[PDB]
Scaffold this active site. Structure first.
Site, PDB file in Angstrom:
ATOM      1  N   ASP A 250      45.099 -36.413 -18.216  1.00 18.42           N
ATOM      2  CA  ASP A 250      43.885 -36.964 -18.802  1.00 18.42           C
ATOM      3  C   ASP A 250      44.088 -37.146 -20.289  1.00 18.42           C
ATOM      4  O   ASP A 250      43.723 -36.285 -21.101  1.00 18.42           O
ATOM      5  CB  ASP A 250      42.700 -36.046 -18.546  1.00 18.42           C
ATOM      6  CG  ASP A 250      41.420 -36.611 -19.083  1.00 18.42           C
ATOM      7  OD1 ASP A 250      41.445 -37.762 -19.562  1.00 18.42           O
ATOM      8  OD2 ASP A 250      40.391 -35.914 -19.014  1.00 18.42           O
TER       9      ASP A 250
ATOM     10  N   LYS B 299      43.160 -40.060 -21.985  1.00 19.67           N
ATOM     11  CA  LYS B 299      42.190 -40.991 -22.572  1.00 19.67           C
ATOM     12  C   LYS B 299      42.896 -42.072 -23.395  1.00 19.67           C
ATOM     13  O   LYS B 299      42.530 -42.347 -24.542  1.00 19.67           O
ATOM     14  CB  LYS B 299      41.187 -40.231 -23.452  1.00 19.67           C
ATOM     15  CG  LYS B 299      40.233 -39.304 -22.689  1.00 19.67           C
ATOM     16  CD  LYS B 299      39.496 -39.998 -21.559  1.00 19.67           C
ATOM     17  CE  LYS B 299      38.349 -39.140 -21.023  1.00 19.67           C
ATOM     18  NZ  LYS B 299      38.848 -37.809 -20.575  1.00 19.67           N
TER      19      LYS B 299
ATOM     20  N   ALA C  75      44.090 -44.829 -25.504  1.00 14.21           N
ATOM     21  CA  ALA C  75      43.147 -45.683 -26.229  1.00 14.21           C
ATOM     22  C   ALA C  75      43.747 -46.303 -27.485  1.00 14.21           C
ATOM     23  O   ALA C  75      43.160 -46.255 -28.567  1.00 14.21           O
ATOM     24  CB  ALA C  75      41.869 -44.899 -26.573  1.00 14.21           C
TER      25      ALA C  75
ATOM     26  N   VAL D 237      30.506 -32.149 -13.722  1.00 12.86           N
ATOM     27  CA  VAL D 237      29.922 -31.304 -12.687  1.00 12.86           C
ATOM     28  C   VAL D 237      29.886 -29.861 -13.160  1.00 12.86           C
ATOM     29  O   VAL D 237      30.885 -29.338 -13.646  1.00 12.86           O
ATOM     30  CB  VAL D 237      30.771 -31.376 -11.410  1.00 12.86           C
ATOM     31  CG1 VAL D 237      30.252 -30.416 -10.346  1.00 12.86           C
ATOM     32  CG2 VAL D 237      30.820 -32.804 -10.892  1.00 12.86           C
ATOM     33  N   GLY D 238      28.734 -29.216 -13.031  1.00 12.70           N
ATOM     34  CA  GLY D 238      28.630 -27.816 -13.420  1.00 12.70           C
ATOM     35  C   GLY D 238      28.201 -27.647 -14.864  1.00 12.70           C
ATOM     36  O   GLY D 238      27.033 -27.815 -15.201  1.00 12.70           O
TER      37      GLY D 238
ATOM     38  N   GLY E 259      26.083 -30.318 -16.328  1.00 10.89           N
ATOM     39  CA  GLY E 259      24.808 -30.487 -15.652  1.00 10.89           C
ATOM     40  C   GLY E 259      24.836 -31.199 -14.314  1.00 10.89           C
ATOM     41  O   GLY E 259      23.834 -31.207 -13.593  1.00 10.89           O
TER      42      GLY E 259
HETATM   43  O1  UP6 Z   1      33.199 -38.329 -19.033  1.00  7.76           O
HETATM   44  C1  UP6 Z   1      34.048 -37.450 -18.995  1.00  7.76           C
HETATM   45  C2  UP6 Z   1      33.657 -36.056 -19.204  1.00  7.76           C
HETATM   46  N1  UP6 Z   1      34.579 -35.127 -19.151  1.00  7.76           N
HETATM   47  N2  UP6 Z   1      35.902 -35.512 -18.903  1.00  7.76           N
HETATM   48  C3  UP6 Z   1      36.912 -34.453 -18.832  1.00  7.76           C
HETATM   49  O2  UP6 Z   1      36.694 -33.750 -17.587  1.00  7.76           O
HETATM   50  C4  UP6 Z   1      36.660 -32.323 -17.831  1.00  7.76           C
HETATM   51  C5  UP6 Z   1      35.230 -31.787 -17.662  1.00  7.76           C
HETATM   52  O3  UP6 Z   1      35.375 -30.367 -17.782  1.00  7.76           O
HETATM   53  P1  UP6 Z   1      34.083 -29.441 -17.530  1.00  7.76           P
HETATM   54  O4  UP6 Z   1      33.876 -29.285 -15.975  1.00  7.76           O
HETATM   55  O5  UP6 Z   1      34.562 -28.078 -18.178  1.00  7.76           O
HETATM   56  O6  UP6 Z   1      32.911 -30.028 -18.197  1.00  7.76           O
HETATM   57  C6  UP6 Z   1      37.194 -32.112 -19.262  1.00  7.76           C
HETATM   58  O7  UP6 Z   1      38.625 -32.047 -19.225  1.00  7.76           O
HETATM   59  C7  UP6 Z   1      36.737 -33.407 -19.955  1.00  7.76           C
HETATM   60  O8  UP6 Z   1      37.599 -33.722 -21.049  1.00  7.76           O
HETATM   61  C8  UP6 Z   1      36.245 -36.794 -18.692  1.00  7.76           C
HETATM   62  O9  UP6 Z   1      37.394 -37.088 -18.431  1.00  7.76           O
HETATM   63  N3  UP6 Z   1      35.330 -37.769 -18.756  1.00  7.76           N
END
Ligand code: UP6
Ligand code: UP6
Lengths: 218, 219
Positions: free
Chosen positions: A62, A64, A66, A174-175, A178
């Site tokens: 992950d 991102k 960009a 998730v979690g 929210g």
């Molecule tokens: O829109 C989003 C929101 N979160 N994440 C990633 O997904 C995970 C969410 O973790 P969490 O369950 O601890 O919130 C983190 O690695 C965050 O960077 C995304 O890729 N996109």
């Protein structure tokens, strides 16, 4: 992609020992781990190969992605060289930047996941207004894997509508942020869960509990 | 603001440690500020920042295009500053909370954030360009002092300079390989970022010297 229990672990611990221990604790429940920059920048890209050696799990990087096309290409090459099965890319920088990633993924036998709408409040400012168009752009480019927001199931549903039932959709938020596991799985193929598992006193029980709550969806 | 020697920042996007060190060393008399991004970091590790500091008297801008949720951004910034980066580049399109998370870590750790406003590649026209004036204004409202804008679109670079004001620090990539002109870009930017035009040259030092010669009246 076939994700065990429709559950992807977001492993954002920043210490190798803890990350390996916690992942090991939930290994019976998952076969797919999302590794991001928190872990990679703290422990190095070698962590990906270590996860493959220890668990055999699929690894989604992950990152991102960009940047401009030329830089995106380099990032994807380095990431796949490290053994990632897939990489998450932003769509906001436009079609040429996405295509650069698709090209490298094809070359190395990997997948690109396109972030369409992020799940945090700030996503409302610029991303949300562009998200349907980013999804259509993915469709035009032949993108098959997408990421959308657990925190906005109406938006997740719209994104599913755009990409169709054949495309693969995963969903974070998730979690901790929210989102609800079962509601999210109405639209997404798999949920991403980080803190609700890796910050739990008992990560195995946290994972087990989530899976129990969605058992009819498996 | 950081005092960038010769108004020229090297974008060191070679992916081999030996080549990256060789080229950077060759241009060190011309450039005291180096932008290191993921091409090099994902290839050679975060310790490449330490090695650059050890080998050269250069400030390091980590071009990580930080673009996640606030909680993840905080972690990325912490790891990056822990490794010795002077500054980090972050995206504004994910919104104000995501930018604020980076600013908070930078404040705590005594380092700097640069905000990407409009990118210089063709794809930037699709979504980024239409958001860029507002991203810049958001930066100003948040107290961002350092910005990145596009050499390839002088008209946009000029407008972004207006938005952020003369007191803000503005650096600009897209010079050389992407089509931007050093002198024209320096009408608006405090410093130019140059990658391929230097690091792919047969003689990177001569390439850097030539760029500097061409903007000498602006130094
Ligand atoms: O829109 C989003 C929101 N979160 N994440 C990633 O997904 C995970 C969410 O973790 P969490 O369950 O601890 O919130 C983190 O690695 C965050 O960077 C995304 O890729 N996109
Ligand atoms: O709008 C842009 C365009 N490019 N870059 C970065 O600046 C450098 C430009 O390199 P170049 O001189 O080889 O084109 C590369 O590292 C690229 O990722 C940006 O940060 N923003």
């Amino acid at each position: 992609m076939d994700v065990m229990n429709r559950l992807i672990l977001a492993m954002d611990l920043m210490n190798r020992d803890d990350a390996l221990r916690v992942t090991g604790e939930v290994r019976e429940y998952i076969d797919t781990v999302k590794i991001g920059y928190p872990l990679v920048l703290s422990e190095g890209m070698d962590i990906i190969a270590e996860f493959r050696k220890r668990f055999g799990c699929r690894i989604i990087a992950d990152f991102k992605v960009a940047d401009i096309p030329e830089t995106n290409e380099k990032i994807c090459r380095a990431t796949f060289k490290a053994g990632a099965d897939a990489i998450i890319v932003h769509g906001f920088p436009g079609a040429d930047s996405v295509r650069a990633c698709l090209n490298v993924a094809e070359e190395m036998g990997r997948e690109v996941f396109l972030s369409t709408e992020m799940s945090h409040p700030g996503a409302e400012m610029f991303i949300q207004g562009a998200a349907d168009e980013i999804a259509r752009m993915g469709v035009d480019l032949g993108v098959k894997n997408y990421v959308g927001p657990s925190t906005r199931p109406e938006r997740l549903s719209r994104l599913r509508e755009i990409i169709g039932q054949d495309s693969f959709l995963i969903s974070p938020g998730v979690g901790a942020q929210g989102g609800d596991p079962g509601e999210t799985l109405r639209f997404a193929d798999a949920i991403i869960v980080g803190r609700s598992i890796y910050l739990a006193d008992n990560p195995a029980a946290a994972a087990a509990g989530i899976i129990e709550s969605i058992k009819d969806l498996l």
